[PDB]
Design a protein around this ligand. Structure first.
Ligand SMILES: CC(=O)/N=c1/[nH]c(C)c(-c2ccc(Cl)c(S(=O)(=O)NCCO)c2)s1
Length: 839
């Protein structure tokens, strides 16, 4: 077809990669995966209810936390419905349905339709209490009145999807290596290391003889491995590495058709920088010109209970109780394996059990499959996301193991998917094959719910733009999604892509008008405005969805308010009009636009923050973190949400006291001067003690607590919040000025500080109840979000931070010391940031 080719060229520009391309291939897994994904796509497309799809009610089935019940002291809730300008308030009970409110309106007042929130593409529809809508719980928590317009359901037809119509030792022959341009050092020796890998576990290892490092090195050696051919498990990687460690590539021993991989290969390798997820990719380097290569030959068809004593059961259960980062001894492993059936009765044993498996042994693998045949206990246990994530990490390369984890995820309501989506997407980096239960799960869930669908797009596009290690895989997944999201969403994405391309192609030019002499002259700010007013007319779209808040529709630029800012990089501060006529307020949408940092680390941190909040919700705690919108759109560059009416703490202090200097009161004065009534001031000191506590606990746990005061902000209403997670010591930032607000000054105790301490201990202990989930997220963040990181140095930090294996009193004691360490030195580390600027 011809109207199918434009559509392909449409999808390419949306994706940022061309998936028809075959240049960087050596087999057909990608195309196979495109074809494979058609079925599950169409199964979810055919399945979804058009009506509920179009309106995508954002809904939860969690209870309602104690601290928001207190905010409805009457079993009634106030909703204000509108038409033109005609408006009326309605008495509603928490258990009322959108259905039970329409008649409480129509049958109540006379002189079909649906309830949409003012200023947003967000709806209150479907069989759910209003108390179980997200927009409603937000309105409460924020002290805000719910505002909603009456109009029609949006036409489901707008979401019309288009139309698609042996038994011997294994051997590998190393021929040679070659880099087109060598020049680097008195080149040491150089050898090839050939690992047979499965789940980061090396099953077998052979090397070449060491030879000189010229731009062409040879061997012609057959390397014989200890493993037999029938002993190879599906998912096994031939991992080929160059030491002198500087280069790596991987080739799957068994392909997507269960065939043993045979023949000649010329593989272009990746270079080490200066363990992590990049080291695992089946993708070869596409830069065939600059990159080191390797040549190999494969010639080698398809794939082929009683009662336990006492003290051992104790020993077993000790092992099972232990944390995800506890090393399993050989003794521990054999214990688990020999008593696998007894181990199978404990859903928590599963990770340690399945890493007690000798995957290099064919007959044991089989027994493990038989073992997985009786899933009774597993299938009936409640969802433990933490358990499930463990099975999706770099430690498991077996499809059956991985699929039981994907099975458990099915029972997640879309609310919870949204919480774990970034990390489920990053977990895709740990899949041996392009077609996985996990990729498909993301596809299904993505297409069933537009909100998920939106974030799935941006999450995948972030990686496609930024890493060659996985861009091909993620691109095939993105195409699968785009092919079913609907014409309405395709148009939307198109809008959004245009805008950010246009806007980034302005962040560049501007940044190069001063390298390090930051000082934004009139010559700079004016030409910025000239670009935008040029853009406004005949290129920049009418209205785009705010990528980090798909609810809000942004309209026209407000040129006058735009700027560059004092930052040592040069980020755009941009403000937009809302395109929604019904918008309750006339306030602008602020979006920062920043080039120079890798925003994916900021994404991973923010999202764990949201997780940490919901974790706290489970125990009726609120720490009012402000996890600001932040989306990585392209390479080294992406957008951020402007929190209105906030300023940096350092910037606050550089208004009263010189520049090099500090002083302790200025925070509290700044608060009193920006809050009108001394009550709204107390509402601010309130907000401060909670927000402060939260960022202290969260921050310590992730070991990102030692920050320079310019990296912490506060709102005009008391809410403190860390920013720019782009990358002697202090556990967190609790400085004298903070303490001054709490009614304390250098080594004493006060009622707000007594509270502060109290809420901290309570917040900490709460996270400790979810220890395992946090350990796995952290290490996955480390493996999929950074350069190189250590498998017991970087990660093993969080065991200690969360104080694994302690009684609550120890834990509380431990944390309260950290509070006191910050006390000792108060301004010490702070001052140092400026001292280093000369040492
Ligand atoms: C009014 C105001 O300053 N609002 C803001 N709110 C937020 C969350 C801001 C923010 C958040 C993150 C980042 Cl990364 C930045 S930034 O201006 O790009 N970086 C400055 C380095 O410290 C600014 S700026």
């Amino acid at each position: 077809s011809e109207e199918s080719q434009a559509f392909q060229r449409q999808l390419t520009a949306l994706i940022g990669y061309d998936v028809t391309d075959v240049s960087n291939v050596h087999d057909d897994e990608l195309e196979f995966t495109r074809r494979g994904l058609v079925t599950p796509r169409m199964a979810e497309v055919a399945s979804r209810d058009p009506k509920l799809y179009a309106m995508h009610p954002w809904v939860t089935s969690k209870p309602l936390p104690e601290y928001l019940w207190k905010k409805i002291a009457n079993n009634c809730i106030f909703i204000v419905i509108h038409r033109s300008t005609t408006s009326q308030t309605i008495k509603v009970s928490p258990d009322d349905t959108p259905g039970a409110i329409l008649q409480s309106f129509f049958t109540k007042m006379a002189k079909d339709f649906v309830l949409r929130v003012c200023g947003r593409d967000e709806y209150l529809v479907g069989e759910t209490p209003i108390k179980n809508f997200q927009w409603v719980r937000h309105c409460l928590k924020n002290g805000e009145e719910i505002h909603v317009v009456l109009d029609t359901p949006p036409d489901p037809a707008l979401d019309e999807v288009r139309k698609e119509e042996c038994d011997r030792k294994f051997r590998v022959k190393i021929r040679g290596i070659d880099i087109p341009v060598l020049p680097r050092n008195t080149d040491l020796t150089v050898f090839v290391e050939a690992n047979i890998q499965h789940g980061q576990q090396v099953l077998c290892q052979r090397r070449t003889s060491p030879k000189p490092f010229t731009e062409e090195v040879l061997w012609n050696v057959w390397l014989e491995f200890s493993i037999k051919i029938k002993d190879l498990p599906k998912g096994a990687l031939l991992n080929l590495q160059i030491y002198c460690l500087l280069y790596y590539v991987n080739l799957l021993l068994i392909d997507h058709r269960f065939l043993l991989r045979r023949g000649e290969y010329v593989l272009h390798m990746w270079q080490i920088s200066g363990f992590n997820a990049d080291k695992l990719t089946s993708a070869t380097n596409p830069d065939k010109e600059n990159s080191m290569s390797i040549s190999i030959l494969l010639d080698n068809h398809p794939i082929a209970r009683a009662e336990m004593p006492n003290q051992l059961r104790k020993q077993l259960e000790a092992i099972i109780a232990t944390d995800p980062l506890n090393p399993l001894t050989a003794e521990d492993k054999e214990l688990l394996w020999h008593f696998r059936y007894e181990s199978l009765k404990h859903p928590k044993a599963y990770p340690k059990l399945f890493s007690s498996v000798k995957w290099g042994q064919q007959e044991i693998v089989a027994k493990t499959y038989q073992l997985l045949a009786r899933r009774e206990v597993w299938d009936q246990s409640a969802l433990d996301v933490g358990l499930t994530m463990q099975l999706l990490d770099c430690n498991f390369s077996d499809e059956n193991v991985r699929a039981i984890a994907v099975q458990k995820l099915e029972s997640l309501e879309d609310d919870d998917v949204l919480h774990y989506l970034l990390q489920l997407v990053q977990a895709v980096k740990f899949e041996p094959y392009h077609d996985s239960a996990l990729a498909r799960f993301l596809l299904k869930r993505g297409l069933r719910n537009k909100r998920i669908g939106h974030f799935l797009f941006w999450f995948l596009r972030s990686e496609i733009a930024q890493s060659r290690h996985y861009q091909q895989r993620f691109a095939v997944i993105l195409e699968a999604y785009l092919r079913g999201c609907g014409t309405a969403m395709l148009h939307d994405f198109t809008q959004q892509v245009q805008v950010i391309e246009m806007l980034q192609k302005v962040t560049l030019d501007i940044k190069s008008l001063s390298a390090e002499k930051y000082d934004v002259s009139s010559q700079v700010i004016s030409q910025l405005k000239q670009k935008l007013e040029n853009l406004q007319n005949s290129q920049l779209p009418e209205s785009f969805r705010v990528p980090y808040d798909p609810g809000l529709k942004a309209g026209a630029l407000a040129i006058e308010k735009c700027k560059v800012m004092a930052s040592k990089k040069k980020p755009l501060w941009l403000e937009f009009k809302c395109a929604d006529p019904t918008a309750l307020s006339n306030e602008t949408i602020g979006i920062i636009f920043k080039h120079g940092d890798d925003l994916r680390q900021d994404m991973l941190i923010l999202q764990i923050l949201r997780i940490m909040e919901s974790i706290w919700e489970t125990e009726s705690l609120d720490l009012c973190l402000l996890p600001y919108g932040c989306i990585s759109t392209g390479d080294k560059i992406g957008m951020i949400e402007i929190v209105k009416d906030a300023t940096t703490i350092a910037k606050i202090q550089q208004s009263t006291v010189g520049n090099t200097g500090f002083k302790d009161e200025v925070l509290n004065h700044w608060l009193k001067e920006k809050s009108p009534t001394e009550e709204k001031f107390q509402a601010a000191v309130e907000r401060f003690v909670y927000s402060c506590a939260g960022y202290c606990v969260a921050t310590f746990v992730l070991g990102i607590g030692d920050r320079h005061n310019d990296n912490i902000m506060i709102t005009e209403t008391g809410n403190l919040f860390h920013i720019d997670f782009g990358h002697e010591r202090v556990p967190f930032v609790l400085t004298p000025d903070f303490l001054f607000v709490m009614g304390t000054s250098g080594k004493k105790t006060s009622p707000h500080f007594q509270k502060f301490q109290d809420i901290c201990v309570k917040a900490y202990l709460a996270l400790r109840h979810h220890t395992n989930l946090l350990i796995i997220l952290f290490s996955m963040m480390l493996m999929t979000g950074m350069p190189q990181l250590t498998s017991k140095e970087d990660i093993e930090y969080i065991r200690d931070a969360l104080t694994v294996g302690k009684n609550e009193e120890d834990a509380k004691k431990y944390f309260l010391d950290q509070i006191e360490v910050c006390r000792d030195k108060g301004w010490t580390v702070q001052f140092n940031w400026f001292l280093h600027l000369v040492l």
